[PDB]
């Protein structure tokens, strides 16, 4: 009589762990961008 | 709405080929907000001869198959709290409001359409563990279907 | 954007070639911002390089060539756009960041800085009660420079 609530959690942790895996990779990317840009700023400033 | 699903989409082309592999359609969907099952998915792609016999996908399929599907899909963002709180009672016959990550993972392991350790491991990083090792399961519910 | 001249800077011995683990500021220094992970990776596409303990000019004018389309892509991104990436980090929208997330995002994701380099980024940035900073002008005020 559980089977079916399981199930229908088990979907929802399914789309949670996505929407989590994605969220933190969007992050990652944001800071590598953002740590690209300031290696590329801080060289010029120095070298220049 | 689309510009953050398109992004979302821009994730998944990991080749940058304009084009997802069709074998990702449900973490897409999951990832843009759905949760369906898994045989949900394969429904929807075996239905349409198009998708049945592609490889990849592009947004704009996708975007189409959304729309025809749109129903279905909109159905698995209902649940509620309540739907899961007997499902923990047989880990919680004394109602004390909390599960050990042991009977959890067994109930998401063990029963059900079974999710492997690697998921459930990936789930406990966004979960809420006390140093008790144990998990307040109206909490944890709430943040599942938190969004 | 290879540059001779800049090469020569780099080349503070006129041996003609400078250090492989150089190549990466001197791509930053002609004008691009790749990631380190695609300085590593275009080094490595090159077989040739395998044990070559420096690189000339002409060999880094080859490569530059080759990988011209990613190195391209390192330049377009204009300020606005770093700006909108850093909403993950703020979904409440409220256009604030606390320094710990900033920090932690800076130096715990990603090609990680030091706590040295972050510390400088601080300097001077405006800080409130709250201890959140206003990200659009930290990340404004670290490209415009």
């Given at each position: 009589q559980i089977s079916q609530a399981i199930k229908y959690?088990?979907?929802?942790?399914?789309?949670?762990?996505?929407?989590?895996?994605?969220?933190?990779?969007?992050?990652?990317?944001?800071?590598?961008?953002?740590?690209?840009?300031?290696?590329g700023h801080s060289i010029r400033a120095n070298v220049f | 709405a689309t510009r953050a699903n398109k992004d979302i989409?821009?994730?998944?082309?990991?080749?940058?080929?304009?084009?997802?592999?069709?074998d990702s359609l449900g973490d897409y969907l999951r990832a843009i907000g759905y949760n369906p099952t898994n045989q949900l998915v394969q429904d929807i792609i075996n239905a349409d001869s198009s998708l049945?016999?592609?490889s990849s996908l592009t947004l704009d399929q996708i975007t189409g198959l959304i729309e025809v599907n749109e129903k279905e899909l909109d159905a698995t963002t209902k649940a509620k709290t309540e739907d899961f709180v007997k499902?923990?009672?047989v880990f919680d016959k004394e109602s004390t409001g909390k599960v050990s990550?042991?009977?959890?993972?067994?109930?998401?392991?063990?029963?059900?359409?079974?999710?492997?350790?690697?998921?459930?491991?990936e789930l406990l990083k966004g979960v809420e563990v006390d140093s008790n090792?144990?998990?307040?399961?109206?909490?944890?519910?709430?943040?599942?279907?938190?969004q």
């Open positions: 959690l088990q979907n929802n942790i399914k789309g949670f762990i996505i929407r989590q895996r994605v969220n933190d990779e969007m992050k990652v990317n944001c800071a590598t961008l953002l740590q690209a840009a300031y290696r | 989409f821009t994730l998944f082309d990991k080749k940058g080929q304009g084009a997802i592999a069709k049945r016999d592609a499902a923990f009672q990550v042991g009977d959890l993972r067994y109930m998401l392991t063990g029963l059900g359409e079974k999710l492997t350790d690697a998921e459930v491991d090792g144990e998990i307040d399961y109206k909490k944890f519910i709430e943040d599942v279907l938190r």
